[PDB]
Design a protein around this motif. Structure first.
Motif, PDB file in Angstrom:
ATOM      1  N   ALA A 165      12.545  -0.060  10.349  1.00 20.04           N
ATOM      2  CA  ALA A 165      12.691  -1.201   9.451  1.00 20.04           C
ATOM      3  C   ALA A 165      11.378  -1.978   9.387  1.00 20.04           C
ATOM      4  CB  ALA A 165      13.828  -2.095   9.912  1.00 20.04           C
ATOM      5  N   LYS A 166      11.331  -2.992   8.529  1.00 21.19           N
ATOM      6  CA  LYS A 166      10.111  -3.765   8.295  1.00 21.19           C
ATOM      7  C   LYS A 166       9.887  -4.840   9.338  1.00 21.19           C
ATOM      8  CE  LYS A 166       9.634  -6.749   4.783  1.00 21.19           C
ATOM      9  NZ  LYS A 166       9.578  -7.205   3.359  1.00 21.19           N
ATOM     10  N   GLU A 167      11.002  -5.292   9.888  1.00 20.92           N
ATOM     11  CA  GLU A 167      11.036  -6.374  10.853  1.00 20.92           C
ATOM     12  C   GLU A 167      10.355  -6.065  12.183  1.00 20.92           C
ATOM     13  OE1 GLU A 167      11.552  -9.357  10.836  1.00 20.92           O
ATOM     14  OE2 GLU A 167      12.083 -10.094  12.763  1.00 20.92           O
ATOM     15  N   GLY A 168      10.782  -4.978  12.807  1.00 18.44           N
ATOM     16  CA  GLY A 168      10.302  -4.599  14.116  1.00 18.44           C
ATOM     17  C   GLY A 168      10.123  -3.100  14.152  1.00 18.44           C
ATOM     18  N   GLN A 169      10.280  -2.519  15.336  1.00 21.90           N
ATOM     19  CA  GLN A 169      10.130  -1.080  15.520  1.00 21.90           C
ATOM     20  C   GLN A 169       8.729  -0.589  15.148  1.00 21.90           C
ATOM     21  OE1 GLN A 169      12.282   0.079  17.240  1.00 21.90           O
ATOM     22  NE2 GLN A 169      14.402  -0.144  16.549  1.00 21.90           N
ATOM     23  N   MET A 170       7.786  -1.514  14.964  1.00 21.58           N
ATOM     24  CA  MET A 170       6.398  -1.166  14.646  1.00 21.58           C
ATOM     25  C   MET A 170       5.515  -2.410  14.598  1.00 21.58           C
ATOM     26  SD  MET A 170       6.100   2.284  14.283  1.00 21.58           S
ATOM     27  CE  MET A 170       4.456   3.020  15.016  1.00 21.58           C
ATOM     28  N   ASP A 171       4.217  -2.192  14.401  1.00 27.05           N
ATOM     29  CA  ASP A 171       3.261  -3.277  14.198  1.00 27.05           C
ATOM     30  C   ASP A 171       3.471  -3.911  12.823  1.00 27.05           C
ATOM     31  OD1 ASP A 171       1.047  -4.995  14.346  1.00 27.05           O
ATOM     32  OD2 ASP A 171      -0.332  -3.438  13.645  1.00 27.05           O
ATOM     33  N   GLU A 172       3.317  -5.230  12.724  1.00 30.34           N
ATOM     34  CA  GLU A 172       3.555  -5.912  11.453  1.00 30.34           C
ATOM     35  C   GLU A 172       2.496  -5.573  10.416  1.00 30.34           C
ATOM     36  OE1 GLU A 172       4.365 -10.088  11.247  1.00 30.34           O
ATOM     37  OE2 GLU A 172       5.379 -10.058  13.195  1.00 30.34           O
ATOM     38  N   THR A 173       1.303  -5.199  10.868  1.00 29.90           N
ATOM     39  CA  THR A 173       0.245  -4.834   9.937  1.00 29.90           C
ATOM     40  C   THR A 173       0.566  -3.503   9.276  1.00 29.90           C
ATOM     41  OG1 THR A 173      -1.361  -5.836  11.487  1.00 29.90           O
ATOM     42  CG2 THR A 173      -2.242  -4.637   9.588  1.00 29.90           C
ATOM     43  N   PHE A 174       1.114  -2.582  10.062  1.00 27.55           N
ATOM     44  CA  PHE A 174       1.447  -1.254   9.571  1.00 27.55           C
ATOM     45  C   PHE A 174       2.695  -1.227   8.698  1.00 27.55           C
ATOM     46  CE2 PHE A 174       3.866   2.611   9.827  1.00 27.55           C
ATOM     47  CZ  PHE A 174       2.932   3.577   9.511  1.00 27.55           C
ATOM     48  N   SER A 175       3.775  -1.820   9.196  1.00 28.85           N
ATOM     49  CA  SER A 175       5.067  -1.755   8.518  1.00 28.85           C
ATOM     50  C   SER A 175       5.086  -2.524   7.202  1.00 28.85           C
ATOM     51  CB  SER A 175       6.169  -2.277   9.444  1.00 28.85           C
ATOM     52  OG  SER A 175       5.913  -3.611   9.849  1.00 28.85           O
ATOM     53  N   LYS A 176       4.370  -3.639   7.158  1.00 29.41           N
ATOM     54  CA  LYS A 176       4.257  -4.426   5.939  1.00 29.41           C
ATOM     55  C   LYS A 176       3.605  -3.559   4.872  1.00 29.41           C
ATOM     56  CE  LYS A 176       4.198  -9.141   7.723  1.00 29.41           C
ATOM     57  NZ  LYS A 176       3.369 -10.344   7.989  1.00 29.41           N
ATOM     58  N   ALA A 177       2.531  -2.882   5.268  1.00 28.04           N
ATOM     59  CA  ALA A 177       1.809  -1.973   4.388  1.00 28.04           C
ATOM     60  C   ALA A 177       2.651  -0.764   3.997  1.00 28.04           C
ATOM     61  CB  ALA A 177       0.527  -1.513   5.061  1.00 28.04           C
ATOM     62  N   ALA A 178       3.469  -0.285   4.926  1.00 26.39           N
ATOM     63  CA  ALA A 178       4.268   0.906   4.676  1.00 26.39           C
ATOM     64  C   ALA A 178       5.371   0.550   3.696  1.00 26.39           C
ATOM     65  CB  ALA A 178       4.848   1.459   5.968  1.00 26.39           C
ATOM     66  N   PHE A 179       5.985  -0.610   3.907  1.00 26.05           N
ATOM     67  CA  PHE A 179       7.083  -1.054   3.065  1.00 26.05           C
ATOM     68  C   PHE A 179       6.616  -1.465   1.676  1.00 26.05           C
ATOM     69  CE2 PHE A 179      11.283  -1.228   4.822  1.00 26.05           C
ATOM     70  CZ  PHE A 179      11.084  -0.867   6.136  1.00 26.05           C
ATOM     71  N   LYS A 180       5.333  -1.784   1.545  1.00 25.70           N
ATOM     72  CA  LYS A 180       4.736  -2.086   0.245  1.00 25.70           C
ATOM     73  C   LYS A 180       4.576  -0.837  -0.620  1.00 25.70           C
ATOM     74  CE  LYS A 180       1.035  -4.856   0.247  1.00 25.70           C
ATOM     75  NZ  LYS A 180       1.153  -5.900  -0.804  1.00 25.70           N
ATOM     76  N   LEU A 181       4.740   0.334  -0.016  1.00 30.13           N
ATOM     77  CA  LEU A 181       4.481   1.587  -0.717  1.00 30.13           C
ATOM     78  C   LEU A 181       5.671   2.006  -1.575  1.00 30.13           C
ATOM     79  CD1 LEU A 181       2.726   3.620   2.110  1.00 30.13           C
ATOM     80  CD2 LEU A 181       1.655   2.837  -0.007  1.00 30.13           C
ATOM     81  N   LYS A 182       5.420   2.935  -2.494  1.00 28.64           N
ATOM     82  CA  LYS A 182       6.473   3.541  -3.300  1.00 28.64           C
ATOM     83  C   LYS A 182       6.785   4.888  -2.661  1.00 28.64           C
ATOM     84  CE  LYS A 182       7.922   2.574  -7.934  1.00 28.64           C
ATOM     85  NZ  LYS A 182       7.745   1.438  -8.885  1.00 28.64           N
ATOM     86  N   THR A 183       7.943   5.464  -2.964  1.00 30.95           N
ATOM     87  CA  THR A 183       8.319   6.732  -2.339  1.00 30.95           C
ATOM     88  C   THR A 183       7.457   7.889  -2.817  1.00 30.95           C
ATOM     89  OG1 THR A 183      10.617   6.051  -2.017  1.00 30.95           O
ATOM     90  CG2 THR A 183      10.138   8.400  -1.915  1.00 30.95           C
ATOM     91  N   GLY A 184       6.842   8.575  -1.858  1.00 34.01           N
ATOM     92  CA  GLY A 184       5.970   9.693  -2.149  1.00 34.01           C
ATOM     93  C   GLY A 184       4.528   9.241  -2.158  1.00 34.01           C
ATOM     94  N   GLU A 185       4.319   7.935  -2.298  1.00 37.50           N
ATOM     95  CA  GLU A 185       2.973   7.391  -2.410  1.00 37.50           C
ATOM     96  C   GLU A 185       2.254   7.357  -1.064  1.00 37.50           C
ATOM     97  OE1 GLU A 185       2.678   3.485  -4.016  1.00 37.50           O
ATOM     98  OE2 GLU A 185       0.487   3.567  -4.171  1.00 37.50           O
ATOM     99  N   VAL A 186       0.953   7.626  -1.103  1.00 35.48           N
ATOM    100  CA  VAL A 186       0.109   7.592   0.082  1.00 35.48           C
ATOM    101  C   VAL A 186      -0.849   6.413  -0.025  1.00 35.48           C
ATOM    102  CG1 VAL A 186      -1.482   9.234  -0.985  1.00 35.48           C
ATOM    103  CG2 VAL A 186      -1.583   8.827   1.506  1.00 35.48           C
ATOM    104  N   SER A 187      -1.065   5.739   1.098  1.00 39.56           N
ATOM    105  CA  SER A 187      -1.813   4.492   1.116  1.00 39.56           C
ATOM    106  C   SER A 187      -3.307   4.730   1.213  1.00 39.56           C
ATOM    107  CB  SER A 187      -1.383   3.632   2.303  1.00 39.56           C
ATOM    108  OG  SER A 187      -1.776   4.246   3.520  1.00 39.56           O
ATOM    109  N   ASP A 188      -4.061   3.639   1.150  1.00 37.58           N
ATOM    110  CA  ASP A 188      -5.486   3.662   1.436  1.00 37.58           C
ATOM    111  C   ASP A 188      -5.614   3.294   2.908  1.00 37.58           C
ATOM    112  OD1 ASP A 188      -6.332   4.342  -1.179  1.00 37.58           O
ATOM    113  OD2 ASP A 188      -6.192   2.242  -1.804  1.00 37.58           O
ATOM    114  N   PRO A 189      -6.793   3.516   3.512  1.00 36.99           N
ATOM    115  CA  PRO A 189      -6.938   3.258   4.952  1.00 36.99           C
ATOM    116  C   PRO A 189      -6.444   1.866   5.367  1.00 36.99           C
ATOM    117  CG  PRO A 189      -8.874   4.378   4.132  1.00 36.99           C
ATOM    118  CD  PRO A 189      -8.016   4.098   2.930  1.00 36.99           C
ATOM    119  N   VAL A 190      -5.568   1.830   6.369  1.00 39.67           N
ATOM    120  CA  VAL A 190      -4.983   0.584   6.861  1.00 39.67           C
ATOM    121  C   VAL A 190      -5.471   0.285   8.272  1.00 39.67           C
ATOM    122  CG1 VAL A 190      -2.818  -0.591   7.516  1.00 39.67           C
ATOM    123  CG2 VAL A 190      -2.891   0.828   5.448  1.00 39.67           C
TER     124      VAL A 190
END
Lengths: 257, 256
Positions: A165-190
Motif C-alpha cells: 500500500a501507499k501508507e507503509g510497507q515501504m519508504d515514502e519516497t518510493f511508494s509515493k512515486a510508485a503510486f503516482k504511476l499508471k499501470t504498465g508504466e515505468v518511472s524515471d530514476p527515483v
C-alpha cells in the motif's frame, strides 16, 4: 562393539560413538527421525526426478551465492541434493493436501484494498540508472535488467516487490512515486536512501471474480511458504501411513500432531 | 547393532546406523563440542551438588509448570547434567573473559540517559499500601522486595538494572519511573503485571568514579552472551589436546 569407536581423543578422556549417539538422540533424535520417515514415505508416494531437483537447486545457488561453496565442501554435493529433494517432496505433499477455500480468496482480495503491485531496479549512481533507462528503451526486458543491475534481493525475481500500500510497507519516497504511476508504466530514476530506482507499476487491484483465479494461486503460494502449513499437510500423509516407532525413547514422535 | 530398527514403515525401516549417520551431519559438531567441553571443564573445575540444586531451583521457578514437562521428557538426571554443564562453562568464562577499558567505556556510553531502579511488584493495591507504610518506618527496600515482590527481581532486592525511556517493561512503568530522583520512591503504579513501587537507585555519573564498579557489570553482561562464554571456554580448550579421529567431524574445533 562399534559403540567403542573413538570419535575424539582427549587428555581429559575420550568421546565414544555410543556417547555421541546417545546425546544426539536426546537432542536431535526426534527431528531427524521425522525427516527420515517423511522423506521415505513421501518419496514412495510422490516422485521427484533429478530434473526437478536441479531446478530448485539452481534457485538456491543464486539466493545463496558464494556461501554455497562452503556448504558444498563441508557437507557434500549429495547431501545438499537430499535436502532439496526433501523440500520438493514436502512441497508436493502440501500441494495435494492443502486446499484454499473461497473464504481464503475473498479474504485475500479484501486486504489488497488500496494496494498495488510493482517491480524495481536498485542502483548506486544516477548515471547507472540512465544506462539502464536507455537499455530499456532500446528494448531490453525489465526482468532481465533487474537480474543484471539491481542491488536488491528482488533482483533474482526480476525485480518484483509483490503487493504493497501507499501508507507503509515501504519508504515514502518510493511508494509515493510508485503510486503516482499508471499501470504498465515505468518511472524515471527515483532517488532514495538506498539509491536510485526504476519502478514499474505492474497492475492495479480492481475486481473479484475477474481476479479470482490469480489470487487463488497467490494464496496457495503463500501457504506454501509457511512451514507450519506444510508440516500440517505432511502430517496428514504420515497418519495415513503405518508408522511404528520401536525405540521407546523416541516413541510418540509421530503419534500425535 | 546399527542394523537395529528404530522405526518401521510401509516404505522401509529406519535403522540405528541410518539415524546415527543423519544426526551426525546435522548435530554432530555441536554435540561433540559439548561432550568434549564437559569432559575438559569437569577435569579443571568442580561443581557442588548445592550449586547444581540452586540453579535447578531457579529454573523450576522461572519455568513454572513448564519444568515438570521437561522433567518428564528428559528426566531429572539429564536436567541436572545440563545444569552442571552450564555451571562449568560459567566458571571457566568467569576466569577467562577479559574486560577491556574499551568494553567499559562503551558500556558507560550506553548508560547515557539511562537510570537504575528497583521495584516491588504486587497483585493488589492493598498490598502496595502496606509496603509504603512499612517503608516510612525505616524498613529496607531490598528487604521488602524479598518479602512482598512477586517479580523475579525479588531476589536482587528488586533491582531492574539500567533501562532507557523506550518502555522496556512497560511505557506506563518507565514514564512513572523517569519522573523520580535518586533516593525517591514512588506510589503504586497500575499495570498489566500488578501494582509497582519503584525506587530509582542511580543516575549516570562520571566515568572515573564509576569505572571499577562498571567492570563487574560488563562482565555479568558478557556472561549472558553465549558467544563470549564459548570464546572464553575455548581459551581453556587451548590448553587441552583435542584430537578428533572421525573423518566427517575433523574440522569441528578448527575455527576460522
Amino acid at each position: 562393539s562399534g559403540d567403542k569407536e573413538v570419535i575424539a581423543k582427549t587428555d581429559a578422556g575420550d568421546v565414544t560413538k555410543g556417547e555421541l549417539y546417545t546425546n544426539m538422540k536426546k537432542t536431535a533424535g526426534a527431528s531427524v527421525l521425522t525427516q527420515l520417515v517423511q522423506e521415505k514415505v513421501l518419496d514412495k508416494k510422490y516422485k521427484v526426478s533429478d530434473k526437478e531437483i536441479d531446478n530448485k537447486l539452481k534457485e538456491y545457488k543464486t539466493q545463496l551465492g558464494d556461501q554455497y561453496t562452503a556448504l558444498e565442501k563441508q557437507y557434500g554435493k549429495d547431501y545438499l541434493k537430499e535436502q532439496v529433494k526433501y523440500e520438493l517432496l514436502t512441497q508436493k505433499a502440501a500441494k495435494d493436501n492443502i486446499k484454499v477455500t473461497d473464504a481464503d480468496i475473498k479474504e485475500y482480495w479484501e486486504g489488497l484494498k488500496g494496494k498495488i503491485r510493482a517491480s524495481h531496479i536498485l542502483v548506486a549512481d544516477k548515471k547507472t540508472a540512465e544506462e539502464v533507462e536507455k537499455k530499456l528503451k532500446k528494448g531490453e526486458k525489465f526482468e532481465d535488467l533487474a537480474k543484471e543491475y539491481s542491488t536488491d534481493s528482488s533482483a533474482s525475481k526480476g525485480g518484483d516487490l509483490g503487493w504493497f500500500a501507499k501508507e507503509g510497507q515501504m519508504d515514502e519516497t518510493f511508494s509515493k512515486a510508485a503510486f503516482k504511476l499508471k499501470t504498465g508504466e515505468v518511472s524515471d530514476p527515483v532517488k532514495t536512501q538506498y539509491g536510485y530506482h526504476i519502478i514499474k507499476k505492474t497492475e492495479e487491484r480492481g475486481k473479484y471474480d475477474d481476479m479470482k483465479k490469480e489470487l487463488k494461486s497467490e494464496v496457495l503460494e503463500q501457504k506454501l511458504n509457511d512451514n507450519a502449513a506444510v508440516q500440517e499437510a505432511v502430517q496428514k500423509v504420515m497418519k495415513k501411513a503405518d508408522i511404528e516407532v520401536k525405540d521407546k525413547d523416541l516413541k510418540d514422535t509421530f503419534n500425535t500432531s
